[PDB]
Amino acid sequence: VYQEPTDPKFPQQWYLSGVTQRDLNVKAAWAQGYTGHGIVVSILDDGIEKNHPDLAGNYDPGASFDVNDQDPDPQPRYTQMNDNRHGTRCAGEVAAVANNGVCGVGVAYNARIGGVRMLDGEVTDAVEARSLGLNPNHIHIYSASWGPEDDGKTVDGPARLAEEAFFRGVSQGRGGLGSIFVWASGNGGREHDSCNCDGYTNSIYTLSISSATQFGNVPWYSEACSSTLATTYSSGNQNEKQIVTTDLRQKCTESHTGTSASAPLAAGIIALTLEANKNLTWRDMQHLVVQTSKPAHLNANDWATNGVGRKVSHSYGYGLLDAGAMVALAQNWTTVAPQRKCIIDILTEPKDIGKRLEVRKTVTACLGEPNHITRLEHAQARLTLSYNRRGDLAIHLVSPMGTRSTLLAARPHDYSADGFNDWAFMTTHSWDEDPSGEWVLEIENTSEANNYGTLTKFTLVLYGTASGSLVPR
C-alpha cells in the first residue's frame, strides 16, 4: 500500500533505497509510516533558500534565523561563485518535498526544515552559541556540516559559549529530553586529519557521522577517529554516484559531496526515529544508533569486535545507519537510566614520553557510589602533555574488555610544539562494556626523530549507567 515517491530524481537517490542493499534502508521506514511529520530540523550553515521549489512546502521560519546579519531571514547571500549554496544542499537532503515533480526527496520529506545563516561571516564563539541555542524548545535536531579547519594540524573545539550551548541544549532542550546535535566528522582525509582533534565531533553531545562511498569504501576525504558513532553514504570517485539535493537558485544538483552530505542524511534518519517515539532522550538516540547500525559490506582495514560483540571501525563507527531498524527499535524503547559520570585521576606523578609510554591502571569505576558505572557509554581520556612535535604522536586506549581505541593517529602536518592541554579524547568503541578493570594508555613516537615530552595529567572520565544490559551480540 505504501507508494514510493514519484519525484523525477528519486530513482537517482541510490542511498535512500535500492535492491542492492547498499542503502540506508529509508524506504522501509517510510513504509512503516514514518516520514518526519511533526519533527523540526535546523541546518546550521551559510543560509537556506527558503523559497526553493523543493523546500518551500517544508520550510519553518521557527527553525530559522540569520545570526550573521542578526535578522530572522536565513536567505543565502547570492554571489557569482554561488559560495553560499552549502546550507541549501544540506537542507534538501533532510527534507526536500516528496511527490511534487521537483528534484528528489529528503530522508524526512514531511519534516519541517529551517536554517541558521551563521557561516557567512566571522564564525565566533558567540555566533556558534546563538546558533546551537536557537529556539531549543521548537527545534528538535540541529545539523552541522562545518567545523575547525581540516588542515591536519589544528586542535580546536567549542569555546565557552558554544560548550555552554551544548550543555544547555542536551539538559533543557526539547522539553528536557535534550537537543539532538548531528555533526559531520570532517573532510581532512587528504591531510591525514583526525576527527579526535576536533572538539565538535569529539563531543559526547554530538552524533559524529562519517561517510562511505557507493562501493562501500572509505572516501578520500574521510577522517578516522574513535569519537565517530556511525556512517551514511556520500560521494567517492567519479564512477560512484553522488548525493541528489536542492541547489542554490532553485536548482537541483546530483553532485553534492563530502562529509557535508553525511550529517544531513543522519539528521533525516533521526527525524524519522523521533517521529516513531517523541520521548527519546539525546542519549536514547545514541543508544539506538549504536544498536542498529550495520557494518556489513563497508570495507575497512581496522574493523574490530568490542567487548559486547559489536563491530567497530575508526572510519565508520558502528557502521551504516539503518533507518528501518532505527524506527522499529524506537517504538517500544525503554528510556535509559540517568547518566552517571565517574572521574578517575590516573597519574600519581608526571611521566616522560620518550620513544614510548605505557600507563596501566586498574579501576573500580566508582564502585559503591551513586556514579558506579557497569555499562559504559562515552569514555574520555583527558590528557595534558608537552611534546616537541605533536603530529608524531600516536595515542591508544585499551579498555578492560580488550577494545583498543586509537585516540590519536600520526598527523604528518602537525608540527606544533604546544602539546595538549586537558584535551578530552573520546571513544565510542567501548559502548555498553563494563569499565571495571585494567585500562591501558599508550603514547608512542611514530617518527625516527629524537622527540621529547612529558605526560602530566591523565583523567579517565567514564559516562554510563549500571542497569539494563543486553546479551552481547
Partner: peptide, 5 residues
C-alpha cells in the same frame, strides 16, 4: 577561517 564548510 576559524570555521569552514
Amino acid at each position: 577561517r576559524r570555521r569552514v564548510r
